């Protein structure tokens, strides 16, 4: 029983060793993801900064082009949501 | 006799080594917790960006719109 | 021949310790499965906004 | 005695189960490759905004 008490133990143990070497890659990939997501925070802060202060200007009709030609706008109601939805 | 004791001693030592390996692996999860905490803000800020883009798009006078219901 | 019993109780003790640490490790793995799901949603909405900007 | 050999067969069976789900943990690597791909896309597309 002692042989049995050792041989399978060593075999399982070697399997554990292999799985452990596989698992230590977790820490590495996880910290790389952490840093990359930190860069995502850095760039998302900038994209917020750019989008917060944006100019929206209506060109108007200073040229005096006839309204017939200017009728380049939809005449059908379309239901779009922004936040609530 | 004493050889079986040598074997048991070597196993317990080997399990101790693995035990250090697994407690290190467990300690690795704190920064996973931090990355979850930051993915929180990821979703929040992304939703804010989406909402800003949507309300900018609806602001165009060319296409009449309407809130559902 | 009692030492054998003493060491055996010791192996049981480190054993329980392995059980608890491995169980919480499984909890960490379950929480990374959550993370996976949320970031999936982040990808979906990012794709939506990429469609919207163009 | 034999009781502890039986118990240890029990604990190594549980151990094999732990390794079973451990093998399932690594499945995240493809999706994290996808998340890096997301970074690349968002960088390329925020380049357009400026």
C-alpha span between A73 and A75 (Å, rounded): 7
Contacts of A73 (CB under 8 A, 6+ apart): B61, B62, B63
The answer to whether the beta carbons of residues B46 and A59 sit under 8 Å apart is: no
C-alpha span between A25 and D29 (Å, rounded): 10
Q: Chain B: which residues have CB within 8 Å of chain C?
A: 8, 12, 15-16, 19, 22-23, 25-26, 29, 32-33, 35-36, 39, 42-43, 46-47, 49-50, 53-54, 57
Task: Reduce the DSSP state of residue B65 to 3 states and report it.
Answer: strand
Determine the distance in angstroms separating the CA of D25 from the nearest CA of chain C, rounded to an integer: 6
Task: Please list the residues that pair with B65 across neighbouring strands.
Answer: A78
C-alpha span between B64 and A76 (Å, rounded): 7
Q: Could you tell me the resolution of this structure in angstroms? A: 3.6
Give D41's contacts in chain A (Cβ within 8 Å).
none
Contacts of D4 (CB under 8 A, 6+ apart): C8, C12
Q: Is the dihedral of CA B22, B24, B30, B31 positive or negative?
A: negative
* Backbone region of residue A60 per phi and psi (left: phi > 0; alpha: psi in -120 to 50; beta: other values): left
DSSP C11-54: HHHHHHHHHHHHHHHHHHHHHHHHHHHHHHHHHHHHHHHHHHH-
C-alpha span between A48 and A44 (Å, rounded): 6
Q: How was this structure determined?
A: cryo-EM
């Amino acid at each position: 029983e002692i042989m049995d008490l050792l041989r399978g133990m060593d075999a399982r143990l070697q399997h554990l060793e292999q799985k452990v070497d596989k698992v230590l890659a977790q820490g590495s990939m996880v910290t790389q993801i952490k840093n990359e997501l930190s860069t995502v925070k850095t760039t998302l802060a900038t994209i917020e900064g750019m989008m917060a202060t944006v100019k929206i200007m209506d060109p108007g009709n200073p040229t005096g082009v006839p309204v017939d030609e200017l009728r380049r706008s939809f005449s059908d109601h379309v239901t779009i949501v922004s936040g609530p939805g």
